[PDB]
Input
Amino acid sequence: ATRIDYYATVGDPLCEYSYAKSGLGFCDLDVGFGDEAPRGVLVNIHYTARFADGTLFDSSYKRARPLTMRIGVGKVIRGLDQGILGGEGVPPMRVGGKRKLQIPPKLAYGPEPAGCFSGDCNIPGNATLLYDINFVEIYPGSNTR
Amino acid sequence: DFPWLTIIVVFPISAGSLMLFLPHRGNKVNKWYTICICILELLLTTYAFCYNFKMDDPLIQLSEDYKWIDFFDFYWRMGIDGLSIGTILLTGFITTLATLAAFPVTRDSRFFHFLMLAMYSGQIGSFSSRDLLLFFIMWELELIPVYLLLSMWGGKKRLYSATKFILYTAGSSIFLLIGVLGISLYGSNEPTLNLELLANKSYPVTLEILFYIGFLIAFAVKSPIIPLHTWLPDTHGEAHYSTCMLLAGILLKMGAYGLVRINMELLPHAHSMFSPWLLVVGTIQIIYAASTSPGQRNLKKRIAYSSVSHMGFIIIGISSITDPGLNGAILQIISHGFIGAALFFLAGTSYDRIRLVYLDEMGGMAISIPKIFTMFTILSMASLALPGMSGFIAEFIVFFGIITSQKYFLISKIFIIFVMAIGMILTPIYLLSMLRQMFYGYKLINIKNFSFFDSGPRELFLSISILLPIIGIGIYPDFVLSLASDKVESILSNYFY
Amino acid sequence: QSKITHKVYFDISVGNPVGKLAGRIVIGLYGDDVPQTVENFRALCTGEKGFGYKGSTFHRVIRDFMIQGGDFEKGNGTGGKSVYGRTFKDENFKLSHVGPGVLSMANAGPNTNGSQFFICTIKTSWLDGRHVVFGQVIEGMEVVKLIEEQETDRGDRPRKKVVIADCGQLPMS
Amino acid sequence: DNGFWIDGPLPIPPIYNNIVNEKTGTRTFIKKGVYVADIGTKGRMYRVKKNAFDLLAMEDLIGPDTLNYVKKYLRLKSTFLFYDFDNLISAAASEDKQPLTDLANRLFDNFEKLEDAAKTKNLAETESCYKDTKFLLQEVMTRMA
Amino acid sequence: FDGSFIFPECILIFGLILLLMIDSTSDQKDIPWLYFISSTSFVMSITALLFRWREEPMISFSGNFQTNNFNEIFQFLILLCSTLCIPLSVEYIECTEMAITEFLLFILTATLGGMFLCGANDLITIFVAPECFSLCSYLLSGYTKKDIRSNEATMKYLLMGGASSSILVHGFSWLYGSSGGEIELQEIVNGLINTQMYNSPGISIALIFITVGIGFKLSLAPSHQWTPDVYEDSPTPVVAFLSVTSKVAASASATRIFDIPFYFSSNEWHLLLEILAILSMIFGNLIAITQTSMKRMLAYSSIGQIGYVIIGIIVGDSNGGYASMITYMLFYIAMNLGTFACIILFGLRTGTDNIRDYAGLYTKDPFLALSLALCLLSLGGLPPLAGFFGKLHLFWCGWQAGLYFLVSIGLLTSVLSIYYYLKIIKLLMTGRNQEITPHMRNYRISPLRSNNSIELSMIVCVIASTIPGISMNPIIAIAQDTLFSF
Output
């Protein structure tokens, strides 16, 4: 709940989530133009991370650097790998893309309080997160390993 | 057209660089080779001056730029102002006479005359550069060669004075570096370094004051401003004559050059903020250094604090926001370049003859060395701001710049004129005390057994050849003011609106 | 523009100096509708407190989209304590993001308004319901365009530090 | 304005509603800082005579490779004449005012043309303007005497 | 599977196999051709690294090793250090009757460990390669084998280096736990915020223990007490090679494991590097005044110059890049190996390392005195030499990033470095017929082997301490194009 690490951003253009089979809130804002994201490679995204109500707890613009992620090998939430690559035939993202995602707590960290440093937690249970992914680029030399 | 100032500056280093090993293990070959190079460089300076320096146009003459580093935007900006060519001619002249006086040195004269030529190039590089960062390059390239001269040649406690000089000038040139970093980076959009492009900026007061302090603490040690002048009675007073006549002739007057070059046309408004304080500090400087001079038992330290005293007129003329003030400051730069050069030369020769440093000993020697006595007497008169000599008209035009100031009112001006005019009472006290100590009088033991050799014709040419432009300016002062008055008008155009 | 209550000025300085003063930003305040955000913004105009928008920057610039500033304690979008203690809520979103030059206060999500605003450029009326929307430019729209036309970096920060030199209250009210 | 050392702009003295300027600008021989003294109206009347005789007896200065000193001497003595005519017309008798200020205008345009002739290093225009400026300097001396 | 990107280290392991084949066949009848195949292995590795210049920054092995242009540059600097330092022990081995074989092996494998530390990307290799290099360091330091002080000093160094790497890897363990089970620097910052451990005390202890271990590797003034004690008895060529190569590979890691997995805690990261940098700049240059030794005060001057390098570490890629740090490391290698070449030649001709024996070098050997004086003035930076422009580029980037209290302290300690440098230059210029020592008066330049390669590499380092300050624009032009460090 608390320890939200206040980073006042400007928000992102809201849209309706064309849902998936696995319950993913899914809304592709800006179709990228280039190659699809490969499975298992390092990719660089920007995102603003939000709770159910939309309050921010994390941002790549907080860190002012695209977050490098090896997607598809399960090093992240399955919501990331199913909303960027696509599990049930959901179309994978192209470079320079933007997409909102409503991660359901089935795909997200359950009712488990993800992150609890000292009494208080980073994420409460069943947070049903809202990610706003700006998939900007592939990592320049990246491998599927 | 022609790379004028580049072949001016690089010629003493690149021509002294032919002393690689050069197997001639006396001082004759490299001695005459270096006086040949210094004469050739002086003739290069005069040929660039008499034939391609328009004394009317108050702009950047003999302009030249190269590329050195693209990241700094650091060029080889060379160019002469009206305030610069007096110092360049003073540089070439005084350092050529310095290596003339540097003939009878024979310890390691190869490395000595090579560093003489290294100073003789680096100083003209400092005065000729239209760049901040190249001014800093040459401001610290004039540091290690005159260190190596100071420490290995001349003076009792010359090691202490040499390390004190090099650490003091380095620990102020870091503030000069802070100033050039500030102006180049946080000066304006498009970070540049050409002073042709840079003297026309806004520079608000909370930034311009910090720039001005960053250069004033830099230049305040080199033109010795009395919070920061501890380096000078050691550096000048414990050096021998040929290095000290350029340490006092031209090395002391850069900085005061920079207070006209960097701290007056680049930063006008904060100079108008702090020149009320620099005026009071210069008036305290003249009295303070003229009163520390009778306290010096040493001979050469009296001339060192005399140099600190005469720099007060330069600080005052710079702080006097006027054409007569700044023009008397340039005149005092050239005048006291001659004066300090000749006095430290004659003090070094007097120590070489008499072998007595202090003035409780070394009584009446004027019957023993009358040529040194008459030249030292006439150059003491030149130091007295006494007429027919350039120091007179220098200090009087500084007084005239005080009394015709639009910056100051009568309440200040009366106090400033009074305190400065006590200085021309205090200056006869120590100068004539020096004269009545080391020359006037009679010692009973000194009759015929010693029979000291007088001034030879070389040293007498040194003294006469410095004396003649002092007289030629003291009777016709437009040998200095006419080559710079146009540029000082271009300076004060930024101050009077 | 429903009842501009307090016209208020604050002036910027683009580029490398701190007092370059390339124009100014004279804006208005709809204080009748929002008392809290307009009161915080008036207290951040040098107010009566020592803290304000003097020395604060525009730490984010996005082209064809709003620019973001107001953070005085930090300079990345974190130090944003208010005059109502540290952080207060949102109030009565009557008017909307009608286009260029709005002083809508930024926040993380609901009920977390701080010291950070953003100046809208293009017509983006979709920010309603989350950001409280108030303020309107009247002088210095080309100055905001001059802020936005600067080339930015990877972290969406301006390469020239666009810092607010002064902030004070006009005698309009 | 703390008594000693008024600071900042360092102004020049203004013109007291006189038409003594060029009107396409103020004047082109204005030396920036000179000390004209507040002596009195007869003192200014005499110093007009003195500096008018100075620019009269500028004969032996004019010559080749000397035009810059001609320009500096002109700017100096004409700045003295400028402030002294400003005080004289500023303390005029309301019927001597208009012919003397017309005299000052037709003198100062002559000074402008001579300063431009000596500024461009052209000796023929220098002497051809110095002829009737010698006429007008004799005229203003025999007016002030 | 084909990792062709690690071909300059394949040339190194090829040279190691040839070293062992020569070290198994005859064992006595090959001193100089072994040095030939080793030096040409260096030159072939350099020309392979230049043949692979324009290649993509591809992570070659299975998420294990990244051949960035930044890593290529630092591998090039380690190869240049090894090339310009490898002739500096062709006379020391024949003077001290040690084995030139397995010494060349030690230098080749220390170069190997440094070049893998530059491109290391898993946390495994950022322990394997530094301590590959450090076990080679302990074998190089315990190599004189004639006394008690050298062996006790290298044993204390082995204790402190094991403590160094173990604190560094305890911090790596807090990375490996706090960031889930993730390694690979690009994936570790992902693993912190997958587990929501960015605002955690565990990652704070991770950063503190990692920066303490790197400060042990960088010998910054909290963790700096090893270098003077361990550079007395350890021989001067390995003092040169190990100090310079250790600090260039440690600045390689100090960029590498500090920008990619620590751009979230960059505030406390910059504050810790600022504390260690300011204390290092002050205390190295303030101890190095008052020591009568020559290699100890050189070790403290190396500490102060690495404290200058940390100003380039703290600045990012943007507001004055790491390119200034790169070109100052190039200058640092170039003007430090010349200093150590002169210190080696004072000891291949005298045998002593006491600084008071230097009184009278100008009269006996003006060439070596000129080379040492010019290298020390490059290290101090009074005329336009290399080190002055390196410190200028550093202080430029620090002033443009706004790090005012870094640049001002760096300038004051640069003046403080100027003092003990010209304290040395007093001795090797002057001489007064009894201030000269009997270890100096019998200099004997003529009882020498041949036209040596120590003199060649020494004058290459002197020219590389003089002209690249003048010719810095191609070096900055080739260093600014390292933007993939992230």
User: Anything to note?
Assistant: The interface with chain C takes residues 318 of chain E (CB under 8 Å). Chain E is about 70% helix and 0% strand. Residues 1-486 of chain E form one domain. Chain E has one domain: 1-486.
